[PDB]
Structure 1
């Protein structure tokens, strides 16, 4: 059929498999449905509507733009980065196809391409390892853009690359008064404090996300990690299983795909269920019920 042909033609340099069980490309004007679905909450199926609209227009420059960000928000970092790369090779001049291709690139701890992605992002800018040239070009220490969100608020990923969890904390704390409304940006200073111990004082910002976006699934993951680091197993497990439960909403009986992207999540209930000696779930709970 025409839909099947669309699927094999997508199965290309633009592979992005995304098992076809969603009836949203059947719905007309999917772009509007996509923008209206996340206007309140639940970016999960909003990312699905973005997939639906982006599936039949390969040349749509802005289709991949929000799709990459919303697929990075929902913790599925794997297919989102290759989708963003395919977006980048089409129009290789945009901050969105480079900023989200740099910070999310470090979640896999691939320090190689992150530096060149940062270089590409800083390219437009109309006005103990390699580091040196990239960091010097970045700098911009109150040179002519004091309190510049995209630069001053950002670039903490560079600090996170060097595992220097002392300068990043301040570089993010005194970077949120400007543009003081972005739940995703909160995560940027929500985990960098957690990674340097200090679990309690990094907890509040997590609830801060719930102040504006009570639909995030990565904030719940981060707070479960922090609680597990604090060895408070029971409610940590309860809240993380709530996080997986909220990760899939609606089309869930048919909303599954390759079932590898939600692997680490379906691993983190492990490494904890063996600490309170209950077990009894182990490999038996393999059906993701």
Structure 2
């Protein structure tokens, strides 16, 4: 290494986002092309590693920060996010993607709080009453707009409004039936509303866009565990654990406190199975 030495605590002094070891990607020649190409033709686990490798070189890579947060959301890892997206927002506050992708990360942890502020910042680029007011905005203007029309469901989900969120997704789903993300939302509202059987089929089809969306199959496991067949949940969470990480010599594990979430489900499953 000679001079490649540390740089880790050097970039960590301000960015608390851990970089972890076992990231050989970082020095082949320039990992950006393989990192970006891995999304289309492969999984989405080592892609985050490549994004981290290209990001650690300098903090001015806006693309690296805006993509690392999005990548560390699919592979169930919504604790390594938030801070990275905030740092990306610090670099540019007019950016559209960082604000849009920062709301999906503050609603999993049930933070509420800054999620409404991020939605307002995205749109411009009682707290709830004010946020919902400005949100209406293009109630009709730019109707064919996918992002604006889909944001209504995200607004409804943070107020336990799973009734109209699915309704606006249904129009948003058919507008651009290509990306899996919009389809996953379509599933979630249904699951989170005494309606499991009406979404699982989408969970299967969503997989044909990119077989790896850990979130869809995790929700599959949750829904079937809530829908009788108490086993099966195990025979999906076990492969969830495997595909989640660990294919590159446990990825240089380090802390992996967040991963606990997944592992937890296994228990609640086994137990209800008397095991």
User: TM-score interval w.r.t. the shorter chain?
Assistant: over 0.9
CA–CA distance in structure 2, aligned partners of residues 63 and 9 of structure 1? 18
SS at match of 2:251: coil
Contact 2:241 2:262 (C-alpha < 8 Å) held by counterparts: yes
Separation (CA, whole Å) in 1 of partners of 2:129 and 2:20: 43
Alpha carbons 1:44, 1:249 under 8 Å: kept: no
How far off its partner does 1:142 sit? 4.6
Offset at 1:271?
0.7
Q: Distance in 1 between matches of 2:38 and 2:142?
A: 35
Per-residue Cα deviation, 1:57-105 (whole angstroms, up to 9, x for no partner): 2101111111111111111001111111111112122111111111211
The CA distance in 1 between the partners of 2:95 and 2:88, in whole Å, is 10
Label 1:140 to 1:263 Cα distance change in 2 as closer, same or farther (>3 A): same
Q: CA deviation at 1:141?
A: 5.3
Report the alpha carbon displacement of residue 254 of structure 1 after superposing the two structures with TM: 4.1
Runs of 4+ residues over 4 Å off in structure 1: none
| TM-score of the pair, normalised by structure 2 | 0.95
Q: What's the offset of the Cα at 1:9?
A: 1.2
| Per-residue Cα deviation, 1:231-289 (whole angstroms, up to 9, x for no partner) | 312111101111111112531334423121211001100111012222xxxxxxxxxxx
Write the distance in 2 (CA, Å) between the matches of 1:255 and 1:173: 41
Q: 1:201 to 1:266 in 2, by over 3 A?
A: same
Note closer, same or farther for the CA distance 1:60–1:141 as it changes in structure 2 (3 Å cut). Answer: closer
| Contact in 1 for aligned 2:233/2:269 (Cα 8 Å) | no
Alpha-carbon displacement from aligned partner over 1:171-208 (angstroms, at most 9, x marks no partner):
11121111211112211111111011201001111112
1:104–1:253: structure 2 CA closer, same or farther, 3 Å change rule? closer
Asked if 1 retains the 8 angstrom alpha-carbon contact of 2:245 and 2:251, the reply is no
Aligned pairs (5 A) from 1:15-164: 15-124=16-125, 130-140=127-137, 142-164=139-161
TM-score (norm 1): 0.90
- How many aligned residue pairs are there? 274
How has the CA–CA distance of structure 1 residues 79 and 253 changed in structure 2, closer, same or farther, with 3 Å as cutoff? closer
Moved more, 253-262 or 35-44: 253-262
Contact 2:103–2:118 (CA under 8 A) maintained in structure 1: yes
Deviates more, 1:248-257 or 1:168-177: 248-257
Is the Cα contact below 8 Å between 1:68 and 1:83 reproduced in 2? yes
Partners of 1:48 and 1:225 lie apart in 2 by: 28
Give the secondary-structure state (helix, strand or coil) at the position aligned to 2:198: coil
Relative to 1, partners in 2 of residues 1:269 and 1:141: Cα closer, same or farther, differing over 3 Å? same
Do 1:13 and 1:86's aligned partners in 2 also have CA atoms closer than 8 Å?
no
Structure 1 gaps of 5+ residues are: 279-289
Moved more, 240-249 or 112-121: 240-249
8 Å Cα contact 1:73/1:184 also seen in 2: no
State the secondary structure of the residue aligned to 1:176: helix
Give the aligned CA root-mean-square deviation in angstroms.
Answer: 1.5
Q: CA deviation at 1:37?
A: 1.5
Shift of 1:112: 0.8
Name whichever structure is richer in helix by fraction.
2
Whether the aligned pair in 1 keeps the contact of 2:169 and 2:182 (CA below 8 Å) is no
